[PDB]
Amino acid sequence: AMEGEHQYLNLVREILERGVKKDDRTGTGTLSIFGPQMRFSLRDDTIPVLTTKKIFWRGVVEELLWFIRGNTDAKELAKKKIHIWNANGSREFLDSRGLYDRAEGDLGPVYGFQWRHFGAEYDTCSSDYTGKGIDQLANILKTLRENPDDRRMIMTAWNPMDLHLMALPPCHMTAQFYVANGELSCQLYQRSGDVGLGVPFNIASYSLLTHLMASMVGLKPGEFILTLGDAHIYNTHIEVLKKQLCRVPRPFPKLRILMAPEKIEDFTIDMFYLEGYQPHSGNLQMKMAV
Amino acid sequence: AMEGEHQYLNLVREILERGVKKDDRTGTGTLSIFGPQMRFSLRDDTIPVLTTKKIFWRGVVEELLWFIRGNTDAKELAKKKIHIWNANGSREFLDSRGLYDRAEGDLGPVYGFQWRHFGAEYDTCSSDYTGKGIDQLANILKTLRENPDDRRMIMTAWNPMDLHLMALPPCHMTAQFYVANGELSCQLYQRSGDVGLGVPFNIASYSLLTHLMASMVGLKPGEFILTLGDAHIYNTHIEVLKKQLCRVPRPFPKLRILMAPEKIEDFTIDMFYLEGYQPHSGNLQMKMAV
Ligand SMILES: Cc1nc(=O)c2cc(CN(C)c3ccc(C(=O)N[C@@H](CCC(=O)O)C(=O)O)s3)ccc2[nH]1
Ligand SMILES: Cc1nc(=O)c2cc(CN(C)c3ccc(C(=O)N[C@@H](CCC(=O)O)C(=O)O)s3)ccc2[nH]1
Ligand SMILES: *c1cc(=O)[nH]c(=O)n1[C@H]1C[C@H](O)[C@@H](COP(=O)(O)O)O1
Ligand SMILES: *c1cc(=O)[nH]c(=O)n1[C@H]1C[C@H](O)[C@@H](COP(=O)(O)O)O1
């Protein structure tokens, strides 16, 4: 009752029991702890997609491919009926950030823009950024092939100069990669984690990324480590999360990668699938705080 | 046998027992694990300066104040008989990084330069950077006073655009601050930790920083959390660390702050002292791998 999905359930219990009350930015209110870490094995093809609640896997995949492409237009996700970024791209939300000149859906130089184009000057979400900025992700993949013992395989979205241009500052903010005994591991530093809503999705996302990167460079996936800053439960999620805690985890699913492309941004959903995913049938709704 | 200094001693043991053989940049060789976390209480004025090995406290203090001032000239530490940065500022080391125009001792836009002037253009270590770049540390102090529940109190030295100008990329790279029940906590993400040499010094440094910041903003110190990426023991340190593991820890010392100045960069060593530090007397030499 300590490994795998129990890492997440034990974190929920810890926050409910010893989390402190916080009047947060959204006005919803939270219970919070600082600095918890969870670790998930990616061996034997395992990927930690929660079974005690059905995770929006199609959204995980498409958001991740959108990040990997460096894209920042929420409308591209919305065309696929993935609406997870629409609220932070709305006219109202953008105006509240002082971003009056931004088109609706244009989140600014967020997440994957920093991963692929760190330091590039942002124009709009539809601009061509090919060859602009520092491609941290491509550089990591090269280092993994050529010098896997390197201790500097860092991918960050925390760019102080660009925060004011982003709809929200990055939650999952800096990742490091590591190789030992033919296995690729990833540690994510996440400054802020909505434990009921974003965190399960973010775990699935970076675990997927680690599997995809490993297949590009001839390694096997090792471990995904999530280290949180402010790990919080929104007051509106407490009752539903108590319900989730009564559920017994089932074995995690496996990822089957059918092929790997030449460049990571060419991965498409047809190149891999989730095998053996058996989430509990009762859907749990966690209203997004805004 | 788990709290306080045992956090560090148990990490040493863990690396010795299950660390994997990993070659490294210096050619010395290491045993390595990825992702370990250590937590230290700063309550009751405690500061986690190791007692199983004498730590160079005066060096910790002067290095930190140098960082806080945004300074980057190793020659200024050497004038104070603190030589810890001399090797990475040498002509030979700078030339090996391609930094041919850099004067000896000028480490570039490292650590505190990023903390106080993120994004500013670097000239030399003697240039005046007042008002240039983003003062992340000052911003954090303001936020702690005005909106302590904020989830963005981040101070980073990881600037992809400036890495090539640095004598070494930052080891201790990104810190986050947090407030609960009138206590200030700090979590440091450290991508690379030399467990025998740098890590004890880095623990003392960021714990001191947390004490000093709390005194600037009317809070009490809470916890210091160190989260490592590549946590490693150099092969040359194994025997001395095994000797250290035989020493019984004594209670950690206490930090006594005598006054707080108006701005954090005005702190001097006369404004605080270490009470009751009783380290084991037999000096343990961990040669720096270069
Ligand atoms: C307050 C806040 N918390 C979040 O976790 C968050 C997440 C995103 C983006 N993101 C990473 C996600 C948003 C929504 C997700 C999701 O998994 N939604 C599911 C379940 C929704 C529900 O249970 O009510 C879905 O739409 O199926 S995942 C944007 C702003 C945020 N804001
Ligand atoms: C390989 C490497 N490991 C490090 O830990 C490291 C640290 C620094 C800067 N730094 C943070 C420090 C360097 C030396 C320290 C120190 O505590 N020295 C003590 C003990 C020396 C010894 O026992 O051999 C001293 O000089 O008194 S603390 C620079 C390059 C590095 N390079
Ligand atoms: C942000 C986006 C993501 O992918 N994951 C997340 O959990 N979140 C959450 C954290 C927090 O609840 C909120 C961001 O608000 P803030 O910037 O921390 O105030 O979204
Ligand atoms: C860097 C400086 C510091 O304050 N603390 C550290 O522990 N180190 C160590 C980590 C590593 O052994 C070496 C830096 O080498 P690399 O850039 O990780 O290859 O110094």
Calpha distance A248→B184 (Å, rounded): 37
What angle do helix axes B238-245 and B5-18 make, rounded to 10 degrees? 130
Whether the Cβ atoms of residue A205 and residue A62 lie closer than 8 Å to each other = no
Whether the Cβ atoms of residue A135 and residue A79 lie closer than 8 Å to each other = no
The alpha carbon of residue A198 is apart from the nearest alpha carbon of chain B, in Å, by: 15
Calpha distance A52→A9 (Å, rounded): 9
Residue A48 Cα to chain centre, angstroms = 13
Give the one of A118, A169, A227 whose C-beta lies nearest to B160's C-beta: A118
**Is B83 at the interface with chain A, CB within 8 A?**
no
**Is B176 at the interface with chain A, CB within 8 A?**
yes
- What's phi and psi for B221, nearest 5 deg? -70, 140
Ligand 1 atom with least separation from CA of A202: 11
Calpha distance A234→A226 (Å, rounded): 19
Is B88 annotated in a binding site? The answer is no
> Roughly how many angstroms between the first and final C-alpha of chain B, as a whole number?
34
Tell me the residue ranges of DSSP E strands in A58-99: none
Q: Is B210 exposed, middle or buried (0-12, 13-18, 19+ CB in 10 A)?
A: buried
Ligand 1 atom with least separation from CA of A55: 17
Domain B5-275: state its class: alpha beta
Tell which residue, A70, A63, A116, has the closest CA to residue A88. Answer: A63
How distant, in Å, are the alpha carbons of A8, A61, A136, A194, B249 from that of A268?
29, 9, 21, 28, 55
Q: What is the CB neighbour count within 10 angstroms for residue A219?
A: 21
3-state SS class at A178: strand
Q: Choose one of A65, A97, A194, A197 to mutate for the ligand 1 pocket test, by most ligand atoms within 8 angstroms of C-beta.
A: A197
Pairing of strands B183-194, B220-234: parallel
Query: Which site among A18, A190, A227 would you substitute to test the B interface, given the most B Cβ atoms closer than 10 Å to its Cβ?
Result: A227
DSSP letters of A116-141?
HHBTPPP--TTS--TT-SB-HHHHHH
**Is B118 at the interface with chain A, CB within 8 A?**
yes
3-state SS class at B257: strand
3-state SS class at B5: helix
Whether the Cβ atoms of residue B129 and residue B109 lie closer than 8 Å to each other = no
Ligand 4 within 6 A of CB of B199: yes
Whether the Cβ atoms of residue B31 and residue B21 lie closer than 8 Å to each other = yes
Q: How far is the CA of B90 from the centre of ligand 2 (A)?
A: 15
User: Which residues in chain A touch residue B154, judged by CB atoms under 8 angstroms apart?
Assistant: 158, 173, 191
Whether the Cβ atoms of residue B10 and residue B18 lie closer than 8 Å to each other = no
Pairing of strands B220-234, B30-34: antiparallel
Experimental method, per PDB record: X-ray
Calpha distance B170→B79 (Å, rounded): 23
